[PDB]
Design a protein around this nucleic acid. Sequence first.
RNA 1: AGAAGCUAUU
RNA 2: AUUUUAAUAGCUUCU
Lengths: 836, 114, 61
Amino acid sequence: VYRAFDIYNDKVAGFAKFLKQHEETIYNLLKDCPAVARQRLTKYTMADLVYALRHFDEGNCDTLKEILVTYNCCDDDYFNKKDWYDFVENPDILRVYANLGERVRQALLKTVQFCDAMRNAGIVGVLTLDNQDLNGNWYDFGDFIQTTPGSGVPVVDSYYSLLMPILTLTRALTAESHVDTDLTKPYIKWDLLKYDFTEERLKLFDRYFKYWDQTYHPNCVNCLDDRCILHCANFNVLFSTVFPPTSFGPLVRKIFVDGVPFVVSTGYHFRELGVVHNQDVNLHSSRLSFKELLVYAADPAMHAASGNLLLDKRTTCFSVAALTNNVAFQTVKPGNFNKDFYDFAVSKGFFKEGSSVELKHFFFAQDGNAAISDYDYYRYNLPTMCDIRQLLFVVEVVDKYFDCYDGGCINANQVIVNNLDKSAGFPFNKWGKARLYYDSMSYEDQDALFAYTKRNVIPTITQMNLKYAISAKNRARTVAGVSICSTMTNRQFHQKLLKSIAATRGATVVIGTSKFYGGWHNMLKTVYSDVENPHLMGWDYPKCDRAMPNMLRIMASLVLARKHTTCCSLSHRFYRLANECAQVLSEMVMCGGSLYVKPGGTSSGDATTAYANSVFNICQAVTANVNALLSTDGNKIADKYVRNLQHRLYECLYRNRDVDTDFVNEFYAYLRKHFSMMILADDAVVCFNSTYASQGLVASIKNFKSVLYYQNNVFMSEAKCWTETDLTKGPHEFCSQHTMLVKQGDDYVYLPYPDPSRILGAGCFVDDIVKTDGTLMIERFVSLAIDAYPLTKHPNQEYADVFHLYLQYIRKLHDELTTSRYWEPEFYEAMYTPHT
Amino acid sequence: DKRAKVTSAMQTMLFTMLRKLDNDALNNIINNARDGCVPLNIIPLTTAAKLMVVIPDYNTYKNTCDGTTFTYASALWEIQQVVDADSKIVQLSEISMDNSPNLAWPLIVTALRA
Amino acid sequence: KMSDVKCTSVVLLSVLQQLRVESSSKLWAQCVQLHNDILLAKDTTEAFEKMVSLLSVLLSM
RNA sequence: AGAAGCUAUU
RNA sequence: AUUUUAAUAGCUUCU
Ligand SMILES: [Zn+2]
Ligand SMILES: [Zn+2]
């Protein structure tokens, strides 16, 4: 009945579920190739396989279940296990998905043979997914126009691009690491000294994608623009799985300083950017300058080479070396107790049984294995090959969200450091802090180091450390400390654009907008805007920082650098992208005295983490809308304007090669009207036309579940997502705050109030012993009262008593201190008044 | 003066760490190069004269480093010292199924290149 | 009054770090697990036995 | 009424 | 051994 189809027609064009002698002459012309079989036709086609794996729904995954059993991927009783499809809970699903990768590979080879026969017979046509079998056999060659033999040109844009995410999900190219490309034969023992693999990359390209009508660059340093980088880097992630893992990373060259042999890094072999080479190398040198000596102490080339080999069975990641003679462990202290506050709280009618407010937030003690287990969570980071046609259209629409800011490069004297005395990273922390390096290396040295970064590559080590913070869950959390060498270059490159976003008001990205003085009301009014049938559908990202694909991280970094069209050349811009990948995406992480390899994901210490998170947040939200519009049947829409949008959206995706600046404007206007966003890093609140979503014209919660499955390798449950139908009460939760409508004079204004248990937990437990005496530090409880004041407006009487308890405890501290302003209940009323 | 002291602090580390490199392999492998370009990941895999193995449990220990000599990275390794998570020397007799619950995992195994 | 058990456990376990109990890694992990399970307990009755058990470990010296 | 420094809170 | 971003309160001096 309902089968997956890939249709382009007069008016209807989409990838949805539509219920279902010329060709005989064509059949004679194309009979020679073994690919052409309609006998031996599998109940399911390659379109059904790619449809189920792209639009995945719990309880409606019957098609995905029947295919897995039919092709002996697993037994039927595997499904009885609860949450089998969840990657995080059930990692064994990857082994089940990887068992039909060889069936995918045989389909790729049979496609080239079919294309070869169609070229030799002088035939022009377009390849679609629904014309194949799961075996790989081809049929459905009707709308093919004859021409002279030897000049036929296949069109393979729709077939290949849709099929791209399945190649890495099923691990189709695993057979290419075996001798003679046969699974039964042993592995290939590549030479340990090989790092080029350029010839095999072209052979891999020429065997699987022979007619991809675009020049492939094995090394991205030879690309033309940033849209070429995304195209060529996408193919590399599929070809980097074949080669041994020891080939990637920095490349070391022997150089001499004062006649003393030395080991430095003069290049880098990225899994995405191919192999690049530095341009300023000195075989023989002399007395080293500060900038040159600083670079020599930051690269992992000599740190790893002077250590000893390490074999760690705890972690499934890549171990490089062990700089220390033995592994080091560290534990976490439990939180301290404010007995005076607790005794006062229990006296004032609190903490009785049967009370709606209790104590739930604590500090949790951790053991030594917590640090390495949290690092081991990077096993959720998997090589993801994205749809490149979708990514090329989406990046333009996402970029239009960022066209109201001013960016560009700044000199070293236009840089603002928020907090100097934090850390300098590894190995710089052994000698000083970030203050030492800023005030020692001069203004001219800083610009030269930025200039040197535009013509070379700098790899760098970033340390990992633990966190001592309050939380309900006992999960450990780790924070990455980036080095001072990588921070200065990124500041001069991005601070102009980052400061502008934190200063712009009334935009989609709401970073830097305060919640005080009516800020909460203004942002909530902006997102409501002019939506016809408002509804709220905030969501959450499962395992955001560990499961981020590297393709979306590279795409986000290019958008942030789209503002350098004047100050930097294209050669200078590529060497900036190369630095970012070698210092954030994949790098050596010092996780407990031993060097490892970071497969990917975000780093806490990266300056642009929050802003790049917003770009990725918009990217998934934009992607979810285009998938919803294309998955909708084009013959059920009634609005003629949307149907033209739904038809031209397909054309701008697959049948085009240049940016269509006109349809991007229409699509951006369409989103701004019906899908209003409020974006702050991972958190997001959306006001959407409920009538459109019920018809399928905009993204829903289900559309986010499907996109997250194939573009993030994570499974989103219905627990952390929410939906509200009446705007009188605002978002169910945004940044861990609730909202309600209260009277203020003659005005109704939204107010943010936190969790009552969280506020009490902060007062009871402090992570420092010196904070026990509140007489010296009264300001801690004053700040908590400011956060907790809106609780007095709650209908629940037990909720309002938290502020009075906080307010009463403030008075009790003032008795020993001696003024009335802190105890004044109108001091906390001014912070939520529009007059600043 | 702040830039002067930090200059001497890190330039010595570049010179006092060249010496720490294993001289019996310094000439043996660091001197050897195919075309002056070699990946960095493989440098410790063949130049290091010392190996450290961290073992989570008994099942992994018997499957990887059973006996006094074990083969890994296409080379024979001779065990030198075994130390538990408490930083205490452990003799090879104690590692068995019977004494597995009494052991303080993880275990640190140190080898030496043949 | 259920939270009174959790507050007592928090101060009780912090005493062990003061007396330098971290030398015994296996013992340290055992008391951490018991303390964490107390904090995550849903029924008040279950937390009573672990609190006494945790108190006994302190009294072992 | 604005700068700048430190501390604390979310 | 303790990272990045943004918001606020307090206090300290400068005119
Ligand atoms: Zn290119
Ligand atoms: Zn620039």
